[PDB]
Design a binder for this molecule. Structure first.
Ligand SMILES: [K+]
Ligand SMILES: [K+]
Ligand SMILES: [K+]
Ligand SMILES: [K+]
Ligand SMILES: [K+]
Ligand SMILES: [K+]
Ligand SMILES: [K+]
Ligand SMILES: [K+]
Ligand SMILES: [K+]
Ligand SMILES: [K+]
Ligand SMILES: [K+]
Ligand SMILES: [K+]
Ligand SMILES: [K+]
Ligand SMILES: [K+]
Ligand SMILES: [K+]
Ligand SMILES: [K+]
Ligand SMILES: [K+]
Ligand SMILES: [K+]
Ligand SMILES: [K+]
Ligand SMILES: [K+]
Ligand SMILES: [K+]
Ligand SMILES: [K+]
Ligand SMILES: [K+]
Ligand SMILES: [K+]
Ligand SMILES: [K+]
Ligand SMILES: [K+]
Ligand SMILES: [K+]
Ligand SMILES: [K+]
Ligand SMILES: [K+]
Ligand SMILES: [K+]
Ligand SMILES: [K+]
Ligand SMILES: [K+]
Ligand SMILES: [K+]
Ligand SMILES: [K+]
Ligand SMILES: [K+]
Ligand SMILES: [K+]
Ligand SMILES: [K+]
Ligand SMILES: [K+]
Ligand SMILES: [K+]
Ligand SMILES: [K+]
Ligand SMILES: [K+]
Ligand SMILES: [K+]
Ligand SMILES: [K+]
Ligand SMILES: [K+]
Ligand SMILES: [K+]
Ligand SMILES: [K+]
Ligand SMILES: [K+]
Ligand SMILES: [K+]
Ligand SMILES: [K+]
Ligand SMILES: [K+]
Ligand SMILES: [K+]
Ligand SMILES: [K+]
Ligand SMILES: [K+]
Ligand SMILES: [K+]
Ligand SMILES: [K+]
Ligand SMILES: [K+]
Ligand SMILES: [K+]
Ligand SMILES: [Mg+2]
Ligand SMILES: [Mg+2]
Ligand SMILES: [Mg+2]
Ligand SMILES: [Mg+2]
Ligand SMILES: [Mg+2]
Ligand SMILES: [Mg+2]
Ligand SMILES: [Mg+2]
Ligand SMILES: [Mg+2]
Ligand SMILES: [Mg+2]
Ligand SMILES: [Mg+2]
Ligand SMILES: [Mg+2]
Ligand SMILES: [Mg+2]
Ligand SMILES: [Mg+2]
Ligand SMILES: [Mg+2]
Ligand SMILES: [Mg+2]
Ligand SMILES: [Mg+2]
Ligand SMILES: [Mg+2]
Ligand SMILES: [Mg+2]
Ligand SMILES: [Mg+2]
Ligand SMILES: [Mg+2]
Ligand SMILES: [Mg+2]
Ligand SMILES: [Mg+2]
Ligand SMILES: [Mg+2]
Ligand SMILES: [Mg+2]
Ligand SMILES: [Mg+2]
Ligand SMILES: [Mg+2]
Ligand SMILES: [Mg+2]
Ligand SMILES: [Mg+2]
Ligand SMILES: [Mg+2]
Ligand SMILES: [Mg+2]
Ligand SMILES: [Mg+2]
Ligand SMILES: [Mg+2]
Ligand SMILES: [Mg+2]
Ligand SMILES: [Mg+2]
Ligand SMILES: [Mg+2]
Ligand SMILES: [Mg+2]
Ligand SMILES: [Mg+2]
Ligand SMILES: [Mg+2]
Ligand SMILES: [Mg+2]
Ligand SMILES: [Mg+2]
Ligand SMILES: [Mg+2]
Ligand SMILES: [Mg+2]
Ligand SMILES: [Mg+2]
Ligand SMILES: [Mg+2]
Ligand SMILES: [Mg+2]
Ligand SMILES: [Mg+2]
Ligand SMILES: [Mg+2]
Ligand SMILES: [Mg+2]
Ligand SMILES: [Mg+2]
Ligand SMILES: [Mg+2]
Ligand SMILES: [Mg+2]
Ligand SMILES: [Mg+2]
Ligand SMILES: [Mg+2]
Ligand SMILES: [Mg+2]
Ligand SMILES: [Mg+2]
Ligand SMILES: [Mg+2]
Ligand SMILES: [Mg+2]
Ligand SMILES: [Mg+2]
Ligand SMILES: [Mg+2]
Ligand SMILES: [Mg+2]
Ligand SMILES: [Mg+2]
Ligand SMILES: [Mg+2]
Ligand SMILES: [Mg+2]
Ligand SMILES: [Mg+2]
Ligand SMILES: [Mg+2]
Ligand SMILES: [Mg+2]
Ligand SMILES: [Mg+2]
Ligand SMILES: [Mg+2]
Ligand SMILES: [Mg+2]
Ligand SMILES: [Mg+2]
Ligand SMILES: [Mg+2]
Ligand SMILES: [Mg+2]
Ligand SMILES: [Mg+2]
Ligand SMILES: [Mg+2]
Ligand SMILES: [Mg+2]
Ligand SMILES: [Mg+2]
Ligand SMILES: [Mg+2]
Ligand SMILES: [Mg+2]
Ligand SMILES: [Mg+2]
Ligand SMILES: [Mg+2]
Ligand SMILES: [Mg+2]
Ligand SMILES: [Mg+2]
Ligand SMILES: [Mg+2]
Ligand SMILES: [Mg+2]
Ligand SMILES: [Mg+2]
Ligand SMILES: [Mg+2]
Ligand SMILES: [Mg+2]
Ligand SMILES: [Mg+2]
Ligand SMILES: [Mg+2]
Ligand SMILES: [Mg+2]
Ligand SMILES: [Mg+2]
Ligand SMILES: [Mg+2]
Ligand SMILES: [Mg+2]
Ligand SMILES: [Mg+2]
Ligand SMILES: [Mg+2]
Ligand SMILES: [Mg+2]
Ligand SMILES: [Mg+2]
Ligand SMILES: [Mg+2]
Ligand SMILES: [Mg+2]
Ligand SMILES: [Mg+2]
Ligand SMILES: [Mg+2]
Ligand SMILES: [Mg+2]
Ligand SMILES: [Mg+2]
Ligand SMILES: [Mg+2]
Ligand SMILES: [Mg+2]
Ligand SMILES: [Mg+2]
Ligand SMILES: [Mg+2]
Ligand SMILES: [Mg+2]
Ligand SMILES: [Mg+2]
Ligand SMILES: [Mg+2]
Ligand SMILES: [Mg+2]
Ligand SMILES: [Mg+2]
Ligand SMILES: [Mg+2]
Ligand SMILES: [Mg+2]
Ligand SMILES: [Mg+2]
Ligand SMILES: [Mg+2]
Ligand SMILES: [Mg+2]
Ligand SMILES: [Mg+2]
Ligand SMILES: [Mg+2]
Ligand SMILES: [Mg+2]
Ligand SMILES: [Mg+2]
Ligand SMILES: [Mg+2]
Ligand SMILES: [Mg+2]
Ligand SMILES: [Mg+2]
Ligand SMILES: [Mg+2]
Ligand SMILES: [Mg+2]
Ligand SMILES: [Mg+2]
Ligand SMILES: [Mg+2]
Ligand SMILES: [Mg+2]
Ligand SMILES: [Mg+2]
Ligand SMILES: [Mg+2]
Ligand SMILES: [Mg+2]
Ligand SMILES: [Mg+2]
Ligand SMILES: [Mg+2]
Ligand SMILES: [Mg+2]
Ligand SMILES: [Mg+2]
Ligand SMILES: [Mg+2]
Ligand SMILES: [Mg+2]
Ligand SMILES: [Mg+2]
Ligand SMILES: [Mg+2]
Ligand SMILES: [Mg+2]
Ligand SMILES: [Mg+2]
Ligand SMILES: [Mg+2]
Ligand SMILES: [Mg+2]
Ligand SMILES: [Mg+2]
Ligand SMILES: [Mg+2]
Ligand SMILES: [Mg+2]
Ligand SMILES: [Mg+2]
Ligand SMILES: [Mg+2]
Ligand SMILES: [Mg+2]
Ligand SMILES: [Mg+2]
Ligand SMILES: [Mg+2]
Ligand SMILES: [Mg+2]
Ligand SMILES: [Mg+2]
Ligand SMILES: [Mg+2]
Ligand SMILES: [Mg+2]
Ligand SMILES: [Mg+2]
Ligand SMILES: [Mg+2]
Ligand SMILES: [Mg+2]
Ligand SMILES: [Mg+2]
Ligand SMILES: [Mg+2]
Ligand SMILES: [Mg+2]
Ligand SMILES: [Mg+2]
Ligand SMILES: [Mg+2]
Ligand SMILES: [Mg+2]
Ligand SMILES: [Mg+2]
Ligand SMILES: [Mg+2]
Ligand SMILES: [Mg+2]
Ligand SMILES: [Mg+2]
Lengths: 49, 272
RNA sequence: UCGAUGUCGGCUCGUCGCAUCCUGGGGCUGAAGAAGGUCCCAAGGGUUGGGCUGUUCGCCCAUUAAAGCGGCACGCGAGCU
RNA sequence: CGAAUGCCGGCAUGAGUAACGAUAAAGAGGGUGAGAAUCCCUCUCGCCGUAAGCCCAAGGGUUCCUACGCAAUGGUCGUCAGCGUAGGGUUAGGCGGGACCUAAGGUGAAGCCGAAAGGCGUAGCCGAAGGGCAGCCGGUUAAUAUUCCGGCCCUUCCCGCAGGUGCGAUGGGGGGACGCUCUAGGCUAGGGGGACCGGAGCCAUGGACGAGCCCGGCCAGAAGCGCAGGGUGGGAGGUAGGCAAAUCCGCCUCCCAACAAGCUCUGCGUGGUGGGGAAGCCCGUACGGGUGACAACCCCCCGAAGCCAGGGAGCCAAGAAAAGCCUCUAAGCACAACCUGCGGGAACCCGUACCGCAAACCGACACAGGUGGGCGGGUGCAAGAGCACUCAGGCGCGCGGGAGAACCCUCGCCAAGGAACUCUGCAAGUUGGCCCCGUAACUUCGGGAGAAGGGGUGCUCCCUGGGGUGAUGAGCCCCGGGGAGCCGCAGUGAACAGGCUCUGGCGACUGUUUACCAAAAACACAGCUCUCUGCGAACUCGUAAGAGGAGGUAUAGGGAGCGACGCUUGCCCGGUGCCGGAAGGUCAAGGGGAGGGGUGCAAGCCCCGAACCGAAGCCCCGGUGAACGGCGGCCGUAACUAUAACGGUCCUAAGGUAGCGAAAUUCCUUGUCGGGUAAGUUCCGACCUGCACGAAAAGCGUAACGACCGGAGCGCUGUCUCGGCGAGGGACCCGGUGAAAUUGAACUGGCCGUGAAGAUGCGGCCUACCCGUGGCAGGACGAAAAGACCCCGUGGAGCUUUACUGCAGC
RNA sequence: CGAGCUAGCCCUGGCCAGGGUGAAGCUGGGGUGAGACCCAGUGGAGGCCCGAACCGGUGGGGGAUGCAAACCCCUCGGAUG
RNA sequence: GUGGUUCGUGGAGCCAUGGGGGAAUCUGGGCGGACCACCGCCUAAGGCUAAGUACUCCGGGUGACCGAUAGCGCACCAGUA
RNA sequence: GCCCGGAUAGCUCAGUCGGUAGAGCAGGGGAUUGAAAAUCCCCGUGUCCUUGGUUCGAUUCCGAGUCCGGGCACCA
RNA sequence: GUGGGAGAGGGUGGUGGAAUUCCCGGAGUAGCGGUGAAAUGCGCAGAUACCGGGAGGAACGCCGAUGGCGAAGGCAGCCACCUGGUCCACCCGUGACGCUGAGGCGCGAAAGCGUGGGGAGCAAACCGGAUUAGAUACCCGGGUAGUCCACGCCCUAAACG
């Protein structure tokens, strides 16, 4: 069947992007937290070009 | 005069389409159409505030003139009569003698060619619009304003009309399409005649799909749901209503009056 | 037996009991004969095909020597339905 | 620490077991190499070909090319690889995106709201597979190419010349600019044919040296020329409209012009010149080169769904915006500027490899699943993207060799019977296409209908009527019609392609649903009724702002029920709801204070507090049924009996009308009778005793519809009597690779007993040499899931309401 | 934190081989005082019919430590809405 | 009308304050738990003020703290694969 | 089988605080009519279902029993 | 043909006043309705009765007749328009063009039916109050469809002279 993961580089960044996080205050904590923990990447890795 | 079909398909048996004879122009007057944002019944939150709405043919708003007095005393020539899919009534394209083109909602009778004008002067003739006070008692009238300069808001739907019944100071006694006896201010304009396309109430959509063309998605009965969803949800088979009939939001719905009592316009109503 | 012993009926495959439905042997008879009745011995084998109903059962159709009754987790769903 | 279905890790059992991932299929020769069924190469064979081929997009991200490699990854093998190591590889003014436009939506000066966080929001801005905008054909690389090179052709910016002209905006106006169905003309893509042009060659096996077979016979191309087609009236006066101003647009009145023309614009043909250029044969390539050659390069036919394109007609459900563009005037400027030519110059950022219906994307896998757009040849079959074969191209599915059991699966045949099978014709058969003939009840007149049932169907020769293209002619096509005959068991000779009828129930209908056990009689549905709602509508979301409703206005909008259509839809308003009642009772805060109280020496200060004045609500009075709802008992009575039209009485708000009725409702019940059958718990017609139908939770019907559910018949059949044979894929044997749940430990027999009540394990007896392989499933109360039923728990959740208490709302 | 699955709506695009059936309207003829209507031709409508793509998921078999955590084969429903 | 305080409406004062009403400048005002008298205590409706207190991302010193299944999740290129 | 209710004149039914029980209809006797009906006048019979108990006394209170009617007979 | 009549003949569009009902206003008090007698019903929540203002529908008193017109069914306030038949006068015109009429076709009261609209009075059905032995009737209080309009059906009649 059609599974649940249907990759879309624009959707990925529109939705989990750095800019996206910094808009909502909930998102800035999501960042606040991933930094305070050491995550190597704060937002998912995407690829425009 | 309404079109019928031979029964060459189930649902053509009963389908009925408006006779489009009084229609004169077919594409609309470009300088007078906006795109209208179709809601699907959704408010500015992304949330349905009106159920079962959406789909339905793409449409182009015709910006129509409901304040007639912003051109007092300039006559116009009825240029066309054309289909407007944003209302039940058909619109008349008119051509003002100073060259302005404007859209009127077409009264019954009004034919391609005649003169129309609005103002205190304004011969008492179908198409002309006057402050109510200068309209002969008993004339039938349409596109009334409720308050002066706020624009026509009354008796605009196909075949509707109000009747001027009397006067009391600044307010004339109007009989609305709904039989109700409202006082309306005298300086309220109203174009004379009734609305026409009166057969409107006789089309028979004929099949589920015709509703769909008009933006009307299916409507599911409380009965048909479960109790999370609706007061009439549930039961084993089929269920009598079981309680005073109600809405999904739970309020009574056979009789229960909702107009607010304290409402200041109470003062200017006298009917039902 | 509830940290699970799948439950009616059909199918298939049986096997055992005998309080015997047939066949075999018998005593009595209100047994002339022929056909029965009743009770005794006997479980070696045999004990049909259909209509109806999920039915077991049952009732009917047409036969038959007969169209037996029970047990096996109301035998059998790691065999099927 | 021995147990916690404990936790982590290790290693066992099942076991050399099941499996090795589409039954498209393989064989050999040669080569490489330590080693080859698995890598290279040739020959043969098979498979795809509306693809299993080719090109975009998204995704992925070096997988691409090459060299050197095989530990691991690869379901076997590996010399190979999408693997390892290294090196190389992606070139643009014109392709795509960005230095352009706007869409939904997002964001958001102003401004509005909100304890905070934040929510809204006209403009503006952002946002594209939509608008706009300038590159075609070849060649070249191991690997990029509309990007590099060749030929031919364009765009914009800057600066010049020259020639024009009141220039000039982010402002005005035009345009851009729009649906669905059907569709004319003329082309193009693409194809088929040729006796014509070109070409290596060929003559086999009986025949053929032939107008033989085989192969090919084009592509791009500015200007100008044609052929098609699109778009567009020309002038003059008036002017208050298009939020300033217009000379523009709009409106008005003149004139000429008008199914055209002329001006434009596009497509197509041609066109300077440029490119390409087969089969075959020989080259050593994993594949490309040479030649074929001075290649030829023409004619005819078919012909798009594409192009001219903003074409045309019909229709109703009534079909984006903004820029580019053209016009118009404002400031400002007019020794500016713009427009037009022609010249030089300038022309950036990002993408570009590879996979891309799949071993590179989504599915943990080199997974039989999923994945959007374009191209998709030929011949035949009525047509077609269908079906069979097949071209280009691509592939044989990354374990094989044998064998010839059961059994399983997929498949083919079956004597006689023909549903006897069974819950049920489940399944499988039969039927199948096109042409013609023919076709019932019933009907809403359309239908039912492909009803049913039949006849025909190939090939050969002769005759012969129309179309299209040519020219009215030949040729090439297309639609045919007549007559003679030929061969088979069979002519839709393969492949694709309804079994039919009669009679019920339910739902009118097409649709819709429980992703993943229910597709339905359920939901929806046109339509009908009721009700709210006068517009800052009601209703809905939100604390609010706001917003939907709706840029709508009672022929409209919300809510509820019913559910095409026909004929209908009875009585009850006592209770509950809703509606109406400016009186009366009651009634909270408040008012009002008769009258008391506490304290002070008092003036005070401070408490209670009776009338009475106090809303909504409740009571009360009425209405109200397509509002919640409800819709009786007993006894008697007719001149044979039976039965009761009739009577008597208790009770009720009122006592069930038409229709229908053992029913999707009937308990007794397989009711009784009739029909079908040899036989009928079913089915159909009836009867009425309706356990416990009955009128919009509609009643009774209804043509048509149905993957619904029922009964029957005909046709046909391996469903069956009742099985047999056969094919292939497994199973089996050998070689390679090698799991799984489960498992206290095991040296793990039968009976009759016994035992916590169903024993391999206890007693007694009986049987029994050790160990395996293929098989079958009776038992290990076999596995699997801490039973899903049941109960328990002062465990939980969803849901109801005249349960309690509250909160929103009113 | 999620609508990259799924549900609905909004914007903008695309898709649906080929056959059948033959509504209205037209046009002619008839008819009539005029009409209605009737017949033919044209026409080409439809939640119309057959059938691929595409969308489905009826019945059956198979699969059931699967090719597959919903697949496969035969069969069937829609296929201009 | 509420909150805070031990104070859950209680005899419910004190502090605070959403609503209503609404003063005075020392002979003014608040307080001592309803209220009154008395006797006291304070000086509302402006603001600032180190230290003594809290914490450990960081540096150091200790340990009847661990010792690679322990000790931080991480002793190792771990908030990684 | 399990619980509720009822049993009063010939029929259909009120009714009781424990003591002398009524309503309609039927029936009976009179009247009215030519005769019947309707109308009118006058007239109850009741062992208050059976049985046992409580009482001074029971149709009345209590326990059982018949009988009738109503609800129930669920998971299984 | 020519000139003229009379007419509720038909169709359309308007328009008038009386009255009924409802609504608003005013003034007023206990009854009003109704019948054979009653009751139901309405009324101090202010009814009946009276005045004023309005709304709406249907029917047209007197004239009015045993009258008129029409083929019939039928037609009645008034005004206009459109329109049928008829009668008389005059003796002009055609020249037997006449009569009837199976079928056909058209009109056709009331009730009824469809789709809309309208709805004051009236009133099948229906509800109450009475009467009766009963009363599913007659009398009374209410009351729906219908009655009215438009279009389209139905086609009956003591459609009778
Ligand atoms: K519905
Ligand atoms: K239900
Ligand atoms: K157990
Ligand atoms: K158990
Ligand atoms: K014997
Ligand atoms: K025997
Ligand atoms: K039975
Ligand atoms: K058992
Ligand atoms: K089973
Ligand atoms: K079984
Ligand atoms: K077992
Ligand atoms: K353990
Ligand atoms: K092993
Ligand atoms: K295989
Ligand atoms: K092909
Ligand atoms: K290897
Ligand atoms: K593998
Ligand atoms: K090697
Ligand atoms: K774009
Ligand atoms: K401009
Ligand atoms: K514009
Ligand atoms: K070509
Ligand atoms: K490239
Ligand atoms: K073998
Ligand atoms: K059988
Ligand atoms: K020809
Ligand atoms: K077929
Ligand atoms: K029905
Ligand atoms: K699921
Ligand atoms: K279906
Ligand atoms: K459903
Ligand atoms: K709006
Ligand atoms: K009621
Ligand atoms: K009520
Ligand atoms: K009432
Ligand atoms: K019955
Ligand atoms: K029943
Ligand atoms: K029978
Ligand atoms: K179905
Ligand atoms: K076993
Ligand atoms: K409890
Ligand atoms: K036609
Ligand atoms: K068609
Ligand atoms: K306190
Ligand atoms: K204070
Ligand atoms: K104090
Ligand atoms: K103090
Ligand atoms: K401080
Ligand atoms: K370790
Ligand atoms: K760890
Ligand atoms: K009683
Ligand atoms: K009595
Ligand atoms: K009488
Ligand atoms: K009346
Ligand atoms: K009425
Ligand atoms: K008459
Ligand atoms: K008469
Ligand atoms: Mg996943
Ligand atoms: Mg880093
Ligand atoms: Mg526009
Ligand atoms: Mg939002
Ligand atoms: Mg439901
Ligand atoms: Mg929910
Ligand atoms: Mg609820
Ligand atoms: Mg309910
Ligand atoms: Mg349910
Ligand atoms: Mg039910
Ligand atoms: Mg209303
Ligand atoms: Mg166990
Ligand atoms: Mg014996
Ligand atoms: Mg004898
Ligand atoms: Mg035996
Ligand atoms: Mg035996
Ligand atoms: Mg038998
Ligand atoms: Mg038993
Ligand atoms: Mg037993
Ligand atoms: Mg059993
Ligand atoms: Mg078993
Ligand atoms: Mg252990
Ligand atoms: Mg280890
Ligand atoms: Mg380890
Ligand atoms: Mg084994
Ligand atoms: Mg084995
Ligand atoms: Mg094997
Ligand atoms: Mg080989
Ligand atoms: Mg080899
Ligand atoms: Mg092939
Ligand atoms: Mg194919
Ligand atoms: Mg491929
Ligand atoms: Mg990419
Ligand atoms: Mg990947
Ligand atoms: Mg490679
Ligand atoms: Mg290997
Ligand atoms: Mg490769
Ligand atoms: Mg590599
Ligand atoms: Mg660009
Ligand atoms: Mg720049
Ligand atoms: Mg923009
Ligand atoms: Mg915002
Ligand atoms: Mg574009
Ligand atoms: Mg471009
Ligand atoms: Mg190239
Ligand atoms: Mg390449
Ligand atoms: Mg190229
Ligand atoms: Mg200019
Ligand atoms: Mg064409
Ligand atoms: Mg070309
Ligand atoms: Mg061809
Ligand atoms: Mg050729
Ligand atoms: Mg040569
Ligand atoms: Mg030879
Ligand atoms: Mg030769
Ligand atoms: Mg030759
Ligand atoms: Mg050319
Ligand atoms: Mg060209
Ligand atoms: Mg002009
Ligand atoms: Mg001018
Ligand atoms: Mg201006
Ligand atoms: Mg032209
Ligand atoms: Mg050469
Ligand atoms: Mg067009
Ligand atoms: Mg802009
Ligand atoms: Mg590429
Ligand atoms: Mg490939
Ligand atoms: Mg590719
Ligand atoms: Mg593709
Ligand atoms: Mg590949
Ligand atoms: Mg591939
Ligand atoms: Mg491929
Ligand atoms: Mg593979
Ligand atoms: Mg795959
Ligand atoms: Mg994969
Ligand atoms: Mg092809
Ligand atoms: Mg093609
Ligand atoms: Mg083909
Ligand atoms: Mg074919
Ligand atoms: Mg090949
Ligand atoms: Mg394959
Ligand atoms: Mg394989
Ligand atoms: Mg056979
Ligand atoms: Mg045979
Ligand atoms: Mg037969
Ligand atoms: Mg049978
Ligand atoms: Mg079948
Ligand atoms: Mg076939
Ligand atoms: Mg028939
Ligand atoms: Mg037919
Ligand atoms: Mg046929
Ligand atoms: Mg046929
Ligand atoms: Mg033949
Ligand atoms: Mg032949
Ligand atoms: Mg039945
Ligand atoms: Mg249906
Ligand atoms: Mg269909
Ligand atoms: Mg369907
Ligand atoms: Mg499901
Ligand atoms: Mg489910
Ligand atoms: Mg679905
Ligand atoms: Mg599920
Ligand atoms: Mg299923
Ligand atoms: Mg299903
Ligand atoms: Mg709004
Ligand atoms: Mg509505
Ligand atoms: Mg609605
Ligand atoms: Mg329903
Ligand atoms: Mg009320
Ligand atoms: Mg009061
Ligand atoms: Mg008070
Ligand atoms: Mg007070
Ligand atoms: Mg009150
Ligand atoms: Mg009441
Ligand atoms: Mg009803
Ligand atoms: Mg029978
Ligand atoms: Mg049966
Ligand atoms: Mg019912
Ligand atoms: Mg009902
Ligand atoms: Mg129904
Ligand atoms: Mg029925
Ligand atoms: Mg039917
Ligand atoms: Mg068989
Ligand atoms: Mg076999
Ligand atoms: Mg085989
Ligand atoms: Mg083996
Ligand atoms: Mg092996
Ligand atoms: Mg385990
Ligand atoms: Mg034992
Ligand atoms: Mg022992
Ligand atoms: Mg032992
Ligand atoms: Mg074995
Ligand atoms: Mg077990
Ligand atoms: Mg348990
Ligand atoms: Mg469990
Ligand atoms: Mg469950
Ligand atoms: Mg509990
Ligand atoms: Mg609990
Ligand atoms: Mg989505
Ligand atoms: Mg979505
Ligand atoms: Mg269709
Ligand atoms: Mg396609
Ligand atoms: Mg697809
Ligand atoms: Mg799909
Ligand atoms: Mg399936
Ligand atoms: Mg299965
Ligand atoms: Mg299909
Ligand atoms: Mg189809
Ligand atoms: Mg659509
Ligand atoms: Mg407190
Ligand atoms: Mg307390
Ligand atoms: Mg104080
Ligand atoms: Mg104090
Ligand atoms: Mg004190
Ligand atoms: Mg140490
Ligand atoms: Mg550690
Ligand atoms: Mg260690
Ligand atoms: Mg570690
Ligand atoms: Mg009695
Ligand atoms: Mg006694
Ligand atoms: Mg007259
Ligand atoms: Mg008249
Ligand atoms: Mg009054
Ligand atoms: Mg006249
Ligand atoms: Mg004469
Ligand atoms: Mg003469
Ligand atoms: Mg009539
Ligand atoms: Mg009538
Ligand atoms: Mg009506």
């Amino acid at each position: 069947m059609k599974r649940t993961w249907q990759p879309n580089r624009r959707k990925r960044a529109k939705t989990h992007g750095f800019r996206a996080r910094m808009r909502t205050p909930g998102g800035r904590k999501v960042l606040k937290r991933r930094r305070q923990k050491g995550r190597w990447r704060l937002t998912p890795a995407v690829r425009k070009r | 005069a309404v079109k019928k079909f031979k029964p060459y398909t189930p649902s053509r048996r009963f389908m009925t389409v408006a006779d489009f004879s009084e229609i004169t122009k077919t594409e609309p007057e470009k300088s007078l159409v906006k795109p209208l944002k179709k809601t699907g019944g959704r408010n500015n939150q992304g949330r349905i505030t009106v159920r079962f709405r959406g789909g339905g043919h793409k449409r182009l708003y015709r910006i129509i003139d409901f304040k007639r007095w912003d051109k007092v005393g300039i006559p116009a020539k009825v240029a066309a009569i054309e289909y407007d899919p944003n209302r039940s009534a058909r619109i008349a394209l008119l051509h003002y003698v100073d060259g302005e083109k404007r859209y009127i909602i077409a009264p019954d009778g009004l034919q391609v060619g005649q003169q129309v004008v609005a103002g205190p002067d304004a011969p008492i003739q179908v198409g002309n619009a006057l402050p109510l006070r200068f309209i002969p008692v008993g004339t039938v009238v349409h596109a009334v304003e409720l308050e002066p300069k706020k624009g026509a808001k009354l008796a605009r739907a196909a075949g509707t009309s109000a009747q001027i019944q009397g006067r009391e100071g600044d307010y004339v006694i109007l009989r609305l399409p709904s039989g109700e006896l409202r006082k309306v201010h005298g300086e309220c304009y109203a174009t004379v005649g009734a609305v026409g396309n009166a057969d409107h109430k006789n089309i028979v959509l004929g099949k589920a799909g015709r509703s769909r063309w008009l933006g009307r998605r299916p409507h599911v009965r409380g009965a048909a749901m479960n109790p999370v969803d609706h007061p009439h949800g549930g039961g084993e088979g089929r269920a009598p209503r079981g309680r005073p009939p109600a809405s999904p939001w739970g309020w009574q719905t056979k009789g229960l009056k909702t107009r607010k009592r304290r409402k200041p316009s109470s003062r200017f109503i006298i009917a039902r």
